[PDB]
Design a protein around this ligand. Sequence first.
Ligand SMILES: Nc1ncnc2c1ncn2[C@@H]1O[C@H](CSCC[C@H](N)C(=O)O)[C@@H](O)[C@H]1O
Ligand SMILES: [Zn+2]
Ligand SMILES: [Zn+2]
Length: 842
Amino acid sequence: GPTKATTTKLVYQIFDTFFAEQIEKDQGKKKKQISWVKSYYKKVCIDAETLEVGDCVSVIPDDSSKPLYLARVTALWEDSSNGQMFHAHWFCAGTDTVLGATSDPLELFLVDECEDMQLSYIHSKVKVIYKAPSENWAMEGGMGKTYFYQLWYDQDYARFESPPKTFKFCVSCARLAEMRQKEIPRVLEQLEDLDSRVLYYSATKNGILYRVGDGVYLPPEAFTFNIKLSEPVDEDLYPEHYRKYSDYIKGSNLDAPEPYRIGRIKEIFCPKKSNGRPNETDIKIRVNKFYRPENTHKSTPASYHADINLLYWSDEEAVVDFKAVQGRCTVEYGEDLPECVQVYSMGGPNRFYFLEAYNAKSKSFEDPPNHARSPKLPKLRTLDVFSGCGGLSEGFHQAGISDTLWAIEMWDPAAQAFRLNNPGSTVFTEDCNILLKLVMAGETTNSRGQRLPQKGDVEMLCGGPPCQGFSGMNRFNSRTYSKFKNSLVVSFLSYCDYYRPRFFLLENVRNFVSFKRSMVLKLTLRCLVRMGYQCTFGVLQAGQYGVAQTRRRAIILAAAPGEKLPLFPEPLHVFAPRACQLSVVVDDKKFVSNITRLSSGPFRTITVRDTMSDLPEVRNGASALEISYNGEPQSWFQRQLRGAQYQPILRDHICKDMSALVAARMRHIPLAPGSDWRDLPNIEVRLSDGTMARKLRYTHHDRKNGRSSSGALRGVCSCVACDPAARQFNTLIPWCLPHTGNRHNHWAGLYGRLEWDGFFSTTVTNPEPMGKQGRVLHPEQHRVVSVRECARSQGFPDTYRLFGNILDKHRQVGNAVPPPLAKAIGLEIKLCMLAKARESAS
DNA sequence: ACTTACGGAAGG
DNA sequence: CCTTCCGTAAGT
Ligand SMILES: Nc1ncnc2c1ncn2[C@@H]1O[C@H](CSCC[C@H](N)C(=O)O)[C@@H](O)[C@H]1O
Ligand SMILES: [Zn+2]
Ligand SMILES: [Zn+2]
């Protein structure tokens, strides 16, 4: 019996209906509808009432889909031909945003939608008040029908942000004009005038300044290098091989896009027009190419041991239109920098280095020529709710922004792992509801003599509520267990409301944005905007930020009104197109995050080979904890995880002890990519212990699948439900997968083998072959993926201690957030705090 | 403590 | 029509 969630009155008032039993109280044309007081500006007008500037009015739409429109008058000028004009800056009602019907009917939002309009279209004068956060907004934990507005709404990305504090002065007009000037690339600093073109030293695009000698990303189609590029099985032996007709290899990186084409700008020129003057509309850049290691004559096999940010210089140049440039990088000579390249790589984002030049004609490496050489903030005190082993906390710690001073996790192994990993934090082993109810009163000491965090002592509240009820792998979500699992979101929001931290982060599975027609996400956003927070939501792919594993996780961010709402991080590593589906459809509206890198990215994809090609071979049912490395790291991922320190001890290289039948099943699965249970031979086998494996028998005709070529049947039960003795044990082929494969996508990926060039599927708590996520066997060895292999799939450093038995270690590793993803989010928050500090300084 | 049998909505 | 994927009761 889980304990009910304790909530403040504020949070309970919104979640009252959904979790009723789980919480205990604690534009188009318009219709015309008339006197005065180049362009003459006057303060007031008389439409039977004294309309002025700064007060909001209403506009009646012709269509009946929207009841009425609300606008704000910004200026009142007179036009001769048009008539009496005024500039209307529109409002978005609460029932049209992402909040849906959840928002109260008296909530309005600012938007960047404005236009000129005639005075006859005004229907009535409506009072709208700017509700603002109080001076004690940080200390409001736990507490007439006119329209009020408090937040500004970005429709494309579904963002809420505090109103921007900045003669017909319209904020929307200025912002849109800034956008128009942002999109157009503009050129400056004339250098030399030539007969057929003009030379320019610098240029500007989207607020980024490009100069002769910088680095530029280009799309994979921008140019190309000079190097030239590039049976019916027996139905008796494999009765279930006919199910491999989809011809879609799971976890394949073959179709992944290529990374960005890096280059160095050599000159900027414009072609002279027919009038003898430069054309500032088309800008043509000449760029020296940079060979990636997989672009040389040595193909991808050259990108197994090489650094992620390594390139080769070349003397081949190309011409590309300026609009194709997709960013800026710092491609600097490796030995030019006084510091080592290892520190330089982490010195800043978007940094590449080259050390040797490449010649395509002779396919040889030379010394790059002479001209190619080219000669604080205090960390936020953090409370982390529902931590576990502390993936998010570790990511933020290595991002350099946070400092986890408290934790909430009752499960003993996870709590002790958190204790071991963060020696300076106080971890509570209790229920979140009990601790919150205790801290409502000034208890300031729990039963174990630990100090609870007081109001004003928490600055960053981060965590992820249990996602076992939200996930799609959960067939029982209407039971009490799943409901009480879902109800912890309300407890998390209660902590957020009570403490009022500067930043609030809620992580969950992707299905969180679609559970019960996205009712939970909508309710969370409504609570966040009712608190007074600036909240945004999105879906991030874990595999695009450094890990070798597909994991789409929903992130909800919020910041205090004085703060700035962080932008979602930009992808760094390319990933398979079928995996990067980050759009969110809520109430038939499609929201996409501010992420612009949708196709490609700077760095290349991380594969399984880069993850676990250095771990020594281990046998099934391993139990040794401290083993020794048999070799140095053999990739960038392993070199980064292990570190430059001399540690020859490997921990947590253990695999679950599978029985004899499961070992025999995982022994007969071939090593070819895309292999799973479907091609298991149907032959009698002798297990490790002395016991016989029967042959699976098909006694019932399969109507939907028909009969095989040999005439044998395909059904295994009376389902087309189960008679007694229909189940058959001790068979190499499992019985359940043939029994119910027709209505479950033929159980693709069960007993599956990872491929070296592929990627991990979404890691779960228990890596068992027969689970819904079943692609767990090693690419070569006949065993399940070890604990260390799983932790590397999640990007955990090899020096990240885990506590408990093997099942508890697997649960800790599979329940966490990949530290690369948390590091990216922390870097975005670092940018936000740096901007706020810079604004505060001057 | 361990093993197994597997619903159904969303997005292309 | 195919693919996703923080797993859970039920049995043993
Ligand atoms: N029947 C049950 N009733 C209540 N909790 C249970 C339970 N079965 C398992 N649990 C535990 O509930 C945990 C998720 S809720 C526990 C975390 C809690 N909110 C906190 O303050 O830290 C799981 O780790 C699980 O170990
Ligand atoms: Zn305007
Ligand atoms: Zn059956």
